[PDB]
């Protein structure tokens, strides 16, 4: 049982996971596997990892009290990407493209 406003957030999450954004959303479909990739400083630099699979599990588990809590996790996910990766990296460009989608949708949903 999600509130009307969190239902709009769930719709945004579904859009971010949809096929049309797959070319730039895929880095965010699961946590960064720093051990498998041997990025040995990832967790020293990124104190609070976040990704869309975790956001979805929290949404489905009714863990977000309001839209701002959902948006905080989405923005944390993007901020981690900007913090960890080189500024000209392909994955930073993908983050910006997906964040543009998110910020437009989040801005435009009904109020309250």
């Amino acid at each position: 049982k999600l509130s009307e406003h969190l239902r709009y957030c769930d719709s945004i999450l579904r859009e971010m996971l949809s096929k049309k954004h797959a070319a730039y959303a895929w880095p965010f479909y699961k946590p960064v596997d720093a051990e498998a990739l041997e990025l040995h400083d990832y967790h020293d630099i990124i104190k609070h990892p976040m990704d869309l699979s975790t956001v979805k599990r929290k949404m489905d588990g009714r863990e977000y009290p309001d839209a701002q809590g959902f948006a905080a996790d989405v923005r944390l996910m993007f901020s981690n990407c900007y913090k960890y990766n080189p500024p000209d990296h392909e994955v930073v460009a993908m983050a910006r493209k997906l964040q543009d989608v998110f910020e437009m949708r989040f801005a435009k949903m009904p109020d309250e």
């Binding site: 880095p27 990025l39 990296h89």
Partner: peptide, 17 residues
């Protein structure tokens, strides 16, 4: 997805797809 070999090699994310 990431190229595991090259990501480990260079210490930064390397895109395979």
């Amino acid at each position: 997805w990431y190229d595991v070999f090259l990501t480990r090699k260079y210490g930064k994310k390397k895109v395979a797809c």
